[PDB]
Amino acid sequence: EFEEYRNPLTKRYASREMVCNFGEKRKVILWRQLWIWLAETQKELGFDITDEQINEMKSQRDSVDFGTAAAEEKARRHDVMAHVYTFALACPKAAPIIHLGATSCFVGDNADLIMLKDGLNILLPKVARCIDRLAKKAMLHKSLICLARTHLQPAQPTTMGRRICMWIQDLLLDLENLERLKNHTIRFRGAKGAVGTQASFMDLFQGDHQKVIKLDEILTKKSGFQRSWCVTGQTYPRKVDIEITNALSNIGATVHKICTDIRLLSSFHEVEEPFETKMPYKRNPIRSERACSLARYLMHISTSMVSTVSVQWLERSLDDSAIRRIVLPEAFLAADACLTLLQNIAEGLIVYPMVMEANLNSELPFLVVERILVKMVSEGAANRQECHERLRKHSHEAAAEIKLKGLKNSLMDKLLNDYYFAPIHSLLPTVLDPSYMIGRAVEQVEVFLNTEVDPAIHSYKDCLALNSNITI
Amino acid sequence: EFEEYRNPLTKRYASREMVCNFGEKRKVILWRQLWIWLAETQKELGFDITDEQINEMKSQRDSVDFGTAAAEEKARRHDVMAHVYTFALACPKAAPIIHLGATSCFVGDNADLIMLKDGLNILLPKVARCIDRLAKKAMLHKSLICLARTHLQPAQPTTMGRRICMWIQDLLLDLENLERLKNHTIRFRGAKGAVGTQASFMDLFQGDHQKVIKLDEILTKKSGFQRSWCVTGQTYPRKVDIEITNALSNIGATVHKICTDIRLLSSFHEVEEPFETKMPYKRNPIRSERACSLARYLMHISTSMVSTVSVQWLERSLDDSAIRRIVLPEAFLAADACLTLLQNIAEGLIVYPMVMEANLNSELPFLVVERILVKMVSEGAANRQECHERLRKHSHEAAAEIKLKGLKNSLMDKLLNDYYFAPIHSLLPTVLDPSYMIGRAVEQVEVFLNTEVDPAIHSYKDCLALNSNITI
Amino acid sequence: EFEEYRNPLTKRYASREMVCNFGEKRKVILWRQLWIWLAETQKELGFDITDEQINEMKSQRDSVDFGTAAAEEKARRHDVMAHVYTFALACPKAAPIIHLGATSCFVGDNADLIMLKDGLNILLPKVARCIDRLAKKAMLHKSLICLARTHLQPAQPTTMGRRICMWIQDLLLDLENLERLKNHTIRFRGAKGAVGTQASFMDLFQGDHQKVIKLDEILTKKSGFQRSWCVTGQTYPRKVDIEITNALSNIGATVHKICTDIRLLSSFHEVEEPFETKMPYKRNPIRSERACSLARYLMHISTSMVSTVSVQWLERSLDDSAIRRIVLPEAFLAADACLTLLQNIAEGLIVYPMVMEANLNSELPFLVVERILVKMVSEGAANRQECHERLRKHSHEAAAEIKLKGLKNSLMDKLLNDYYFAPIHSLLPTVLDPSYMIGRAVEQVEVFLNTEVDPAIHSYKDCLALNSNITI
Amino acid sequence: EFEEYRNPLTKRYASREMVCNFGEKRKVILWRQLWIWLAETQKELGFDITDEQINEMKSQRDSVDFGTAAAEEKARRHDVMAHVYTFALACPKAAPIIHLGATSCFVGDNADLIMLKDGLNILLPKVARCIDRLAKKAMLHKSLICLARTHLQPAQPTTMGRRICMWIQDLLLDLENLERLKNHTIRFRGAKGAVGTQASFMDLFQGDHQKVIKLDEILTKKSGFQRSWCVTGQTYPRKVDIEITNALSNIGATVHKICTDIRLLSSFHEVEEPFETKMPYKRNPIRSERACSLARYLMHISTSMVSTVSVQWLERSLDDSAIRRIVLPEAFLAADACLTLLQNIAEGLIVYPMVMEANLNSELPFLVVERILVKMVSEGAANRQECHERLRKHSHEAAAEIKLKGLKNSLMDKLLNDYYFAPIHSLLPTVLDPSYMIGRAVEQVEVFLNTEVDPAIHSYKDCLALNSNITI
Numbered sequence A, B, C, D: 001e002f003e004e005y006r007n008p009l010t011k012r013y014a015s016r017e018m019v020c021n022f023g024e025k026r027k028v029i030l031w032r033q034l035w036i037w038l039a040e041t042q043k044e045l046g047f048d049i050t051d052e053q054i055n056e057m058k059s060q061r062d063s064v065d066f067g068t069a070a071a072e073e074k075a076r077r078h079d080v081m082a083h084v085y086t087f088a089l090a091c092p093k094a095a096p097i098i099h100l101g102a103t104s105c106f107v108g109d110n111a112d113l114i115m116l117k118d119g120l121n122i123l124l125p126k127v128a129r130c131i132d133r134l135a136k137k138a139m140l141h142k143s144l145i146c147l148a149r150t151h152l153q154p155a156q157p158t159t160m161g162r163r164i165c166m167w168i169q170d171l172l173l174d175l176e177n178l179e180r181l182k183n184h185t186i187r188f189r190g191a192k193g194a195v196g197t198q199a200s201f202m203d204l205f206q207g208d209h210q211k212v213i214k215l216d217e218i219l220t221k222k223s224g225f226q227r228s229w230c231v232t233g234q235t236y237p238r239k240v241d242i243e244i245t246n247a248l249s250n251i252g253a254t255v256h257k258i259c260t261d262i263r264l265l266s267s268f269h270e271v272e273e274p275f276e277t278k279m280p281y282k283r284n285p286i287r288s289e290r291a292c293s294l295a296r297y298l299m300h301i302s303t304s305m306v307s308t309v310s311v312q313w314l315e316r317s318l319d320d321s322a323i324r325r326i327v328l329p330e331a332f333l334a335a336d337a338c339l340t341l342l343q344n345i346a347e348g349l350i351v352y353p354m355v356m357e358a359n360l361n362s363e364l365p366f367l368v369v370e371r372i373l374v375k376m377v378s379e380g381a382a383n384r385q386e387c388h389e390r391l392r393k394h395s396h397e398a399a400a401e402i403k404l405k406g407l408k409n410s411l412m413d414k415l416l417n418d419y420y421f422a423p424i425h426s427l428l429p430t431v432l433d434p435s436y437m438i439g440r441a442v443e444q445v446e447v448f449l450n451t452e453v454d455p456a457i458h459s460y461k462d463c464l465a466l467n468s469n470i471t472i
């Protein structure tokens, strides 16, 4: 168990249920469930399949002899057919009617779509929880004033909750894309035959178009889908796999930016990721870096799907089978692992207001030179061009004292001792109040959380209790 | 003009109007139009901006002195500010109120969104035309029976129009994704200020939240958008650029598969791309290969956008400006060039029914061995296992005569001279009729074209007349 | 074992020894071996480490208590430190000197480089075998004349062995790149300390530069390397990981082209991949498609490494740890799986000369029209422009009979019954001899195999016996 | 000139000579030069080509009538053939022997290889200059002590020049890879004919293998190459294009990391990029961000080349022509633009020692707790476990005063007033001297610059004078 390379997604990062969502046992159970639905539908459509045969497949659907299946696959060189005969050996009564009229893609593609849809159902509450936990921090810190940063340089002040709403906005689009995949984009393949023309099922029903349509119509309903593709080749359109990985890779870009921002702010000592207390105020963003690492892998996992779809030859070419075994589950496992890390970091995100105030104060004298300029022109009868060049000379020499000599910012005292800036000497004691410079930061948080966030996660307000633990 | 490297997208492949959609003249006109809308909105919101100033900006919006702008940019090292002062020099009356309270991203990001939206408006009718031209070929050849191919090997017969509907289904999803970008995903940035808090506009309106909201509300309306982002940083969420390139790269995967299929079938002499007659029945798929080449470049153009978005630091970092100048226009130009090639190839696609019939006939004796087996068991009282092994021995030796000795397929005469297959000797003269093996291929074309294709392109039935000429 | 998602590379495609090359047991054994070499080197450099301590680490290097290590990691949240204390508990005598003066990257990075180098040593003989098996087929079929294909259209005749040499040329460059990685590019990290300055080891040796240099010099020798990096940060330059995945992705591009070519020629019935006989002359390129699928995944696995290296912050940032656990082993496992498939397909590649002759004959009358034109001008006193237009009219109508009416090529009989082409009527009986049109195809195979292939694999002529079995 | 989209690489970022290296005029001149060399070689090999014909091609090689060529291409739909007839119209004497026996890839592929090789000759001195300028800064600041950063958190002190050597090491590998491409990997295609068998040239020389070999041997020499491929299809192995873009993309990863590091350190006010003085000590890393943006585009430009090579069908398929027109020149233009930015930033890189000392001092009391622990055990007879827990309690509460209360680090005064730490009270006044903690940082710079950098750029010591100006 330790001598072989263990993929870290399955063993170290992704959740238990997502790993089991793509296990081989889960897959063959779906294969056997589809053969059951096929026989149930064929029987109720006029075909002679006794319910004694159907209940025999039902009785031993969950007991798969993988020892026989592996031996069958080595001798038949066909994985689906190996499990056809394995299920047939376990079901002697129902053996002649198993997989009747269908091809291996009937169980292959339809069970994939079931696993892919169930994978989204696993991811969706975790995206919603990430939104919920960040939305509570954004509301909690909607007035916590801090320095905004452009080019990683100090910019005009904002609030920490206002910055968090910037992160949530991206998560709102990922949730929207994932819901669209599950509710609209992903359809059922159904029973289309070898090349999508349903010729085999047309033979079985003696050329009755209506029964063949209803067979496909019923199977789509039994498997939990709303509609099926109508003009497939042998498979469902592989462009669907692009849509899935694109949406999942899109989550990776969001998680990577959020956690890079958290890593950046951690170096300014303004925030810190949570951690197991098993030092508390002097450590590294270990979890945010891991999320960035896993998000970057997820970010690029889509590059091999697009080129795979572009070389699907005509009705079907098998050079998509192996790569889909890898990319699709690992894309879900990485997305699951990133959202697990993101919710944990969002839940226990620590902030340090006094450092935010200290960093804000040391840069504020430079950030107010323009509203001081407006004050001199509007209230001091100062010439715009003349007051600007003088403020520049004072700012230029004060900025030199900061970087060249390592001194503290004394720009405000430079203007105080300057006769020219007499009209603003009275406002200088309180000109560095960060509370009147944040514009509508607080109000934007309120409207955004109330109007855009709350309705977007409304249907998940019953799945938001589960906290995200990081044991490793 | 020939000494410098000329990007082939702008000179050789993409359409005139898409190239001009991203020209610098078009961009600065948008920049000046946004400054006009800003002044028009600020004036009607209570700010003192005389309409004499507004109409002066209107009079010389379309006349840009690029000689001054380049000189300003070299001395200011800022492209937007260079065009602020250039527009200010041309507008002495309105100079003090140009770009009032806004940052360079007010014109930078909003004009990009206008150009990106207009780029989709250029692409959408071309996608619809590609669907329309393929839909007419699919209806025209809904009964043209031909060999379907899996693993590039002969499979059960289908029809050429049924295979074309497989291509159209992918184009229906690309049209759907592009419409969703333009109608829903792409929003306006509006007037958000330096860090998205609208602090500057709050200063100008003396802290009136209502006027600041209406300023953003009116600008969103004037620029032709329905809503704006509410919690930006300095820019609109760059995840939008991922959504755009992902949808455009998705078109590349579709075009590449369609044209690879056309290239494959051209080697079997069953189809041939159109060509300028300026030999007619002996040439190379030059246009389909070019479309594949341009589609593959478009397919992967999205890989640099996702990593760019993932490293956007906090409120804004300028390492997305240069790459967006390249990737976004070239993604549109390549998509435009592929759809131009795809419509041209779809319009003049030639088919050769006699080759389709000949290729069908040479492979049909192998494709009917299973329905012959069913005939022997159902009508000849033959044992399934015993009739299967005998059909295999006849098929094995006939397949050896094909590849080893280069002879023609004589499997049907092998069964005719076999006493065992007496019950099927009467059906052997007509057992190779491809008309009863295509299942529901014809009916699937009808339903698909009537129910899914026709409504999807309904709003474009006025833009479908323009044919796609390939001069190069 | 079947309820969890099993990565198909480790379970289905890659070889046993490559899977075990990256197992966790193998890794910790390397970690313990490096701590041994560290103590052995420190002891022989003047530090007080008794050989009783060293042999205690030696006695229980191969017995790893993973139960303790997992419990230590959950409480310490550090995988290396968990195995420091686990090895320390198993080695009470040597516990105080384990990991002395080094950081976790001493075992982390150095053991990775050992595993990466050993991975290349696994791949190199398999690349050589792929070259050897293809070189034997190329020599075997150096005179087997067949149709060359451009734009997938028939071109001038070549030979099958000459086409195989085209494949081998790409494999010669992949072998060359892999040897360069192992012999030159990959260096040792050594003992550099926390930030690469060796400050800790300088403290231990009381500031003796010479002992610190020799410590790094000896460790590089003991671990089987020739040199070490001199100016690292905390890790070895991650650009090395780009070089590795680029070379491995390069193998994927080669394997994909070779096996796509085999898939294409299989549809013309001129070749066929090997297969387990457990129909023989009527089947699908199942193995070549799987190789294409795995090669395409390997082709793109490099895209996440380049962006990881580009965001390594300053001396070290941990957002490369998780993705390196995935990409580096899976890149080796996929490369190993592709070369396994490629050698198997190369060993048992079947050719069909009579189909090659038949396909050649049906297209030869079009491929000789230009040398007939030269014959008419050089020997028949024909005007070039006048003889060209007449040959075109005969070729145009013959090409129409092929595609429009499905008839056989009767161009040679069109020229025979034409009075104009009297000077070439005598050569017409034998003008379709493919043996005088292949140029230097045979001689090129001889020189290439003797001068370029044989020396390139000379050092592997003892590893070429092992055949490649595909059980699945 | 402003109405059409102008690719920013050609107009804004890349150098003049690199843009002209891929211009169409430069290409056709190479096409005409190859036809000249072909005639010169054929004439001196026994073929009847009078030097009057050869000098006529020589006289008007540089005067290309692009008006005729564009008209020829529109009517012939073939760009090479259009310039064959255009050159033929300008050369009536030599018209019958132009392009004799060769195919369009003779000029197409060989001129590409000449342009690609000349592109490397443009890049190589710029890589060397980047190394030279960084090596001078590394030597200049080999003793400038500063804080090293892991996880973007403060780590053990190093020196600025020692950190720069970390950047140079990556550039040494890119220079090494580029030299290997130009001197070894890139070969000549030569005169191989339509499918690489040289059948046409064998016809012209009446089947003389020796003259055909010498024709290819001489052309390889005349064009400035050392050897040619021997077993091509119609083109040179497109894997070469992968090797080129991989090496160029590798430069992008290096430039992106260097300039991200410069962007990070600029936010700590320890360095600052150069800038046109046309504020000086308060601005944004505009140039480093642009380099990151262009490097990221270059980083991923390789993703479309690998998939293009993987789908080259058999002897040749034309779906690589269009994408090679785009990717190969833009990869060189982006690499050229990044190295231009990198050298400019390296030349004028500003450092601020007092900020480095201030940042170092505020974090040093935490970075010395472990060597204080060693001092207490080695010199104060303190128990290791007992002295560690006490140092932790003092460090834990001091770290809380930093982040919670925003106070300054008073850990050293906490130990001074603690009776337990009496043995280290005397060393406390000077325990924060950063000069004894940097290990071998200074010596590593000396050895690295003298032994690895100086020999690597030895052949470029005549191309190092040219400074890199950034006008935009």
Ligand SMILES: Nc1ncnc2c1ncn2[C@@H]1O[C@H](COP(=O)(O)O)[C@@H](O)[C@H]1O
Pocket (backbone or CB within 6 Å): A077, A078, A079, A080, A104, A105, A108, A318, A321, A322, A323, A325, B150, C286, C289, C290
């Ligand atoms: N048309 C087909 N549809 C589904 N599976 C197939 C088809 N043809 C072959 N297979 C099987 O699919 C498996 C290929 O899986 P992979 O290892 O991913 O290539 C093998 O067991 C094949 O026998």
Ligand SMILES: Nc1ncnc2c1ncn2[C@@H]1O[C@H](COP(=O)(O)O)[C@@H](O)[C@H]1O
Pocket (backbone or CB within 6 Å): A150, B077, B078, B079, B080, B104, B105, B108, B318, B321, B322, B323, B325, D286, D289, D290
């Ligand atoms: N915050 C900003 N928003 C918009 N443009 C900016 C900003 N800061 C600098 N610029 C300008 O944007 C241009 C950068 O373009 P690029 O060449 O794509 O990097 C330069 O002219 C800069 O002066």
Ligand SMILES: Nc1ncnc2c1ncn2[C@@H]1O[C@H](COP(=O)(O)O)[C@@H](O)[C@H]1O
Pocket (backbone or CB within 6 Å): A286, A289, A290, C077, C078, C079, C080, C104, C105, C108, C318, C321, C322, C323, C325, D150
């Ligand atoms: N500087 C470092 N070098 C090596 N490993 C570290 C370092 N810092 C933390 N770690 C550990 O590395 C592991 C991260 O692995 P991953 O799950 O790939 O992020 C965790 O056990 C961390 O405690």
Ligand SMILES: Nc1ncnc2c1ncn2[C@@H]1O[C@H](COP(=O)(O)O)[C@@H](O)[C@H]1O
Pocket (backbone or CB within 6 Å): B286, B289, B290, C150, D077, D078, D079, D080, D104, D105, D108, D318, D321, D322, D323, D325
């Ligand atoms: N075998 C060939 N080798 C070189 N060029 C060709 C070949 N076949 C066609 N062409 C021409 O190459 C050009 C294709 O360029 P692109 O626009 O990049 O597809 C057209 O002018 C074609 O006529």
